[PDB]
A paper describes a structure:
In the fullerene cone HIV-1 capsid, the central channels of the hexameric and pentameric capsomers each contain a ring of arginine (Arg18) residues that perform essential roles in capsid assembly and function. The ability of the HIV-1 CA protein to generate two different capsomers is controlled by a molecular switch—a Thr-Val-Gly-Gly (TVGG) motif—that adopts two distinct conformations which dictate whether a CA subunit will form a hexamer or pentamer.
We initially analyzed R18L CLPs, which were assembled by incubating the mutant HIV-1 CA protein in 1 M NaCl. In contrast, the R18L pentamer unexpectedly adopts a configuration that is distinct from the WT pentamer. Instead, the R18L pentamer is similar to the previously described crystal structure of a disulfide-stabilized HIV-1 CA pentamer harboring the N21C and A22C mutations. Thus, we conclude that, like the N21C/A22C disulfide crosslink, the R18L mutation allows for assembly of the alternative pentameric CA ring, which has no need for refolding of the TVGG switch into its 310 helix configuration. In the R18L pentamer, the leucine sidechains are within van der Waals packing distance.
Residue numbers in the entry:
A (entry chain A), B (entry chain E), C (entry chain D), D (entry chain B), E (entry chain C): 1 to 3, 10 to 85, 96 to 219
Amino acid sequence: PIVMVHQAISPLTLNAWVKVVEEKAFSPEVIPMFSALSEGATPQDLNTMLNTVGGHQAAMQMLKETINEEAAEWDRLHPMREPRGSDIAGTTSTLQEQIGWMTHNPPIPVGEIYKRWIILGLNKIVRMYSPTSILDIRQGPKEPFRDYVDRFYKTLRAEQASQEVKNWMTETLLVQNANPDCKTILKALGPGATLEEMMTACQ
Amino acid sequence: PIVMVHQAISPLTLNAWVKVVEEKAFSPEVIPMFSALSEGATPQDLNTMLNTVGGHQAAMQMLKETINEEAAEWDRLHPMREPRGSDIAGTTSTLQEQIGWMTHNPPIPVGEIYKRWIILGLNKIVRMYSPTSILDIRQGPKEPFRDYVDRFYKTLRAEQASQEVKNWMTETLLVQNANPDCKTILKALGPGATLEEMMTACQ
Amino acid sequence: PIVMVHQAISPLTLNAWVKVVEEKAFSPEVIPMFSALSEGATPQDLNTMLNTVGGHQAAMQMLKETINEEAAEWDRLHPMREPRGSDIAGTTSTLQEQIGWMTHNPPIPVGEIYKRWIILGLNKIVRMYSPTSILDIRQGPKEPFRDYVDRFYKTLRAEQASQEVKNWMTETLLVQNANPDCKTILKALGPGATLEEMMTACQ
Amino acid sequence: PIVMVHQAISPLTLNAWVKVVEEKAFSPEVIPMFSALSEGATPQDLNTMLNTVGGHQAAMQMLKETINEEAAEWDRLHPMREPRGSDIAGTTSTLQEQIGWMTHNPPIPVGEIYKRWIILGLNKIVRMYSPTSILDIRQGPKEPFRDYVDRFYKTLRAEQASQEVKNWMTETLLVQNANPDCKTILKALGPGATLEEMMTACQ
Amino acid sequence: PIVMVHQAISPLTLNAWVKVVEEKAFSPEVIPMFSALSEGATPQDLNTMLNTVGGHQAAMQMLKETINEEAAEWDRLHPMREPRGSDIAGTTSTLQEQIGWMTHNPPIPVGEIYKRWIILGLNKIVRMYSPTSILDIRQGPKEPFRDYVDRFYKTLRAEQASQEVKNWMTETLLVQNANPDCKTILKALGPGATLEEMMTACQ
């Protein structure tokens, strides 16, 4: 990272990243992990981080394709030297040039732009690995209400609905997709009931 | 943490937190762990920590609801700019504003207030996820006395009884709810016998 | 720890401690782990460390009983303010007072005395959880000699025999309690044979 | 490492390296791990790192043989003292001489030369441990398309084909070697279809 | 360690050591790890490190016996104060004295001598726990050639043969002890074939 002088990336960050990816794959919570681990990262460090993933090479090739396409679109829209597309990807620029950019006046936040492209690609990948849609989640005859609610809320988070859409899904789908007994309990609770009241009544 | 200058959050804290939650769920001892891991944390850091949990998304939504309700009640009671409820929760304030606040004279301890709200929500959730009451724990015909005592004391800790109530429960319930052989042994020991003496006599 | 200024306790120490207790219970080697992890700890830190154990709440109550009894005996024998019994246990003293005491001239090593009380309680508890005595360990008809010797020496360490007693036990008991074939081999080796020679002859 | 003064190598790097090798063997992503962990390493540190691997002793001896061959060829092409072949391997030079070299003006990048030889040997070994060729990868009757594609791309990365060859393999082989249903779907998609479109159509 | 002032040993080193011993027992690669973790260690630190091992108490008693034997022989051969035998083992000297010796002029590297004795004892124990000799490794009818070669070379590394003897063993024994198909392949390859060529031909 940069903190102003350059500091070597620690092995701990690499090990944490590889372990999170091995254990959690592309579950939605991996993205805030990337965001925390990439604080202050240069493009070289980010490329190192990307290369450190051992599995899922299809996803990583997709990521390379998306980042290079976004860099080409940047070069089409936005023609010490000025950084070009191949400069943002860290493949034709040296560390010293990146350090110079990070400490120039005014600063050119090339790291933040690369991180934004990377988070866009990860969002695409997480969207791709979405197991099932929200409408396909229905409570089993003996499925625990808490476990079913947790799975439903996880699926809703996995989707890309807007806040108004997410709120409407939370309201309508949860009551509509519940098992008949829990649906009757919620209906007896009445509209406007908070999540805690419904959960404590169902149990 | 803050130590005064800002320091980057370490990967170790995130990994420890995720591992404790995966391995222990909401057992009571997770809260002092949270308290230790959040030493000097800004609210942004707390939101990062919260978002990194991958499962139990019902619980995390419950926590968000409780924190936002407490921030609204604070704003109702307590109407550099002055922080509003959503400012205390770190959703509309930047890191730089938080660093400025942490080093202001007099300091405005937004981190301690946010931590208090979070610990209130965790206490509520642990109390809600309490498996069974104290009165339902009875010793089996061949259950080991040490294991039964450990389970009883764990259940008592899980409850929210006051110190006088907890002491009365420890005295009356333990002797009354024990299996007949251990109850007879304790009665033969006599009143005022310490816990260590009773345990070493039962074994 | 204190190193002189106060430094926040690291998550690594908490995670190591909880894991050692989970993996090793009260095997004798857990005590040197406590001694290493509690270097420079304040009483607040010790209470934090104790509270982080999730299981074995019987053991922790026994520890609380022993520490409070020893603090009462200390107050009976030993009636900036002077610390009382409840001050060493960190329940009625603040962090700032502990820092002041730790950096006074002359220093009052309240942490080392508290550590001594804690180690006394751990020695008492480990002795209590001793599975079996030394005399009940006899080699099986087909039990490997190395595994049996390792188990025997572990049991001997678990006991509280003096150095002269331990040495006599190592000499007499090992040869006497061994299976007949290994006993004959050791007798053929002759007195004064070192442990390595006996082990390499038996194998 | 050197950062300029010498710093002791941390235990974390050694533990990370041994664990990565234990868990991933010589999968291709292990090479970027070596590259990140060996930042600033002296030859002594690199020899320690290599020797700490416990299994796969055939591969590590092969690496020693290969490195000594490059050192002999270097001595053939390139006959404060000057470093000789056995000096590049760190077997006949002291710490003081290597530190002196690392800080000479002009610098003699003995670490970079040793690292290049090591990465060449690891690349040779990974090529040797290549399980199967690309042409032997065929989709099963019920094999998931995503898993098959991931395995195919992993195998392709494991190979040493040039960029033009790799691109032609990705285009022709993937469509030709797929199962009939996915092949028909891809043909219906038409030429020029991106990886994301093909993957989202197949699923 | 000493780096010159004394620094407290970190919990990370202890945890790494206990984990390596738990996971690898006395496999040969544990020794260079010990050597790296004990950089700059005083004898007090070495005794602490040793005591943190929870299992394998037979081996540790053997190690104590061996170290005391070298200290007695040293005292027989080698009769600010001068360090005696019991002083090198850290049982009768204080920390202040050890720091004083480590910084004396000329320095007396009593720590290096203790480390040499410790590595001698570990080498003796690893040799003793050597499972089988080199001559007993024969390829199975369907055993993979790579796995068999790795196991054979690991066994060879476990031995203490000289370089000329080890090299002759690697050449003659590997080809002679191989399964008939691989032996025929190697014979068809001809003398002077390198290990990589033979391995890539066999596969």
